[PDB]
Design a protein around this ligand. Structure first.
Ligand SMILES: NC(=O)c1cccc2[nH]c(C(=O)N3CC[C@@H](N)C3)nc12
Length: 351
């Protein structure tokens, strides 16, 4: 080929997010039977059918027994084959089972997108496949200079917002990318001047990032069980880097992960302390705020291109009997998010 002219950090990003073996590894991490459901046989309609069966399992658990559940749990396993040999798989009979399988299905939806991009399209060995795959993301990706103002603010955000209760690891910022998904700016226009716009974190497994950059952050589909997500079917964000970093699902066997910083238009927040599996916001609300016991110190907010960055060190919020140690922010319209940066992080585990 010509050999790519992209900067090396951008090339390495493209390599990581389109790694087919990582996709396969994630599916084995989910107990999927790759002989019965190989990567190439995943389809939207099969994942969608699985989501529905999980919504039936949800409904049986809301209204309570193991006998009447068994049939439903089996139906889920029929649609998504799990590698249990000659078996009896584990009974899917509680809320935790429903959240875990809905999470798995979310991830399979993104793997399916990434693979479809790989298989869709043309084969030209005189082009560098890195260049070819970058183009399928329909996203401008630039390296942010480590010496800039915007690099310094981002690094401070990471330095200051690592929770003490997440101290099994720390984080080194490897590369900072500035990202512009095509059309996203136009989509965000109605919200661009909204009050309470904030620069927030969203972590995700590296196998999701081809789908995120190509399709943006999405809400779980109508078939998905609303009860699989603490504040229902929205797009979730944190103001503590370590709370979002936890969702990268890195480890000692793969310690490099990816995190997003998005401009999120929060407007009038619906403030909550416990699980609320809502389908819509109340009239007049634009988002949910999951109220943490700890918040970044409000007095250290700083501005980055007019957007507030809540990069203070963690202090008591004064909120009392809350299910959340840290804040969470949820929007329910995909248009309220404008992704701005992507960080490649290295996780130093101390265990
Ligand atoms: N992904 C995030 O950064 C995040 C931030 C704050 C709270 C969250 N809650 C979740 C969460 O419910 N997820 C990610 C796995 C997905 N299937 C469910 N993600 C976050």
């Amino acid at each position: 080929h010509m050999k790519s002219k992209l900067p090396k950090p951008v090339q390495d990003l493209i390599k990581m997010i389109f790694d087919v073996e990582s996709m396969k590894k994630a599916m084995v991490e989910y107990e999927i039977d790759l002989q019965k459901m190989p990567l190439g046989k995943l389809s939207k309609r099969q994942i969608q059918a699985a989501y529905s069966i999980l919504s039936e399992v949800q409904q049986a658990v809301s209204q309570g027994s193991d006998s009447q559940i068994l049939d439903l749990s089996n139906r889920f396993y029929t649609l998504i084959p799990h590698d249990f040999g000659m078996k009896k798989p584990p009974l899917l009979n509680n809320a935790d089972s429903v959240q875990a399988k809905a999470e798995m299905l979310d991830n399979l939806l993104d793997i399916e997108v990434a693979y479809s991009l790989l298989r869709g399209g043309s084969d030209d060995s005189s082009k560098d496949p890195i260049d070819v795959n970058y183009e399928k993301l329909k996203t401008d990706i630039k390296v942010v200079d480590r010496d800039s103002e915007e690099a310094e603010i981002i690094r401070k955000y990471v330095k200051n917002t690592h929770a003490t209760t997440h101290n099994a690891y720390d984080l080194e910022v490897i590369d900072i990318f500035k990202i512009e998904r095509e059309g996203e700016c136009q989509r965000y226009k109605p919200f661009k001047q909204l009050h309470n716009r904030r620069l927030l974190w969203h972590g995700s497994r590296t196998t999701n990032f081809a789908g995120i950059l190509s399709q943006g952050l999405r809400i779980a589909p109508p078939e998905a069980p609303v009860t699989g997500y603490m504040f229902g079917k929205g797009i979730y964000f944190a103001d503590m880097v370590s709370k979002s970093a936890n969702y990268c699902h890195t480890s000692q066997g793969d310690p490099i992960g990816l995190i997003l910083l998005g401009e999120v238009a929060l407007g009038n927040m619906y403030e909550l302390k416990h699980a609320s599996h809502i389908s819509k916001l109340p009239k007049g609300k634009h988002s949910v705020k999951g109220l943490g016991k700890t918040t970044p110190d409000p007095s250290a907010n700083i501005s980055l291109d007019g957007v507030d960055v809540p990069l203070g060190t963690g202090i008591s919020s004064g909120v009392n009997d809350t299910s959340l140690l840290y804040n969470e922010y949820i929007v329910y319209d995909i248009a309220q998010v404008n992704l701005k940066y992507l960080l490649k992080l290295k996780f130093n585990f101390k265990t």
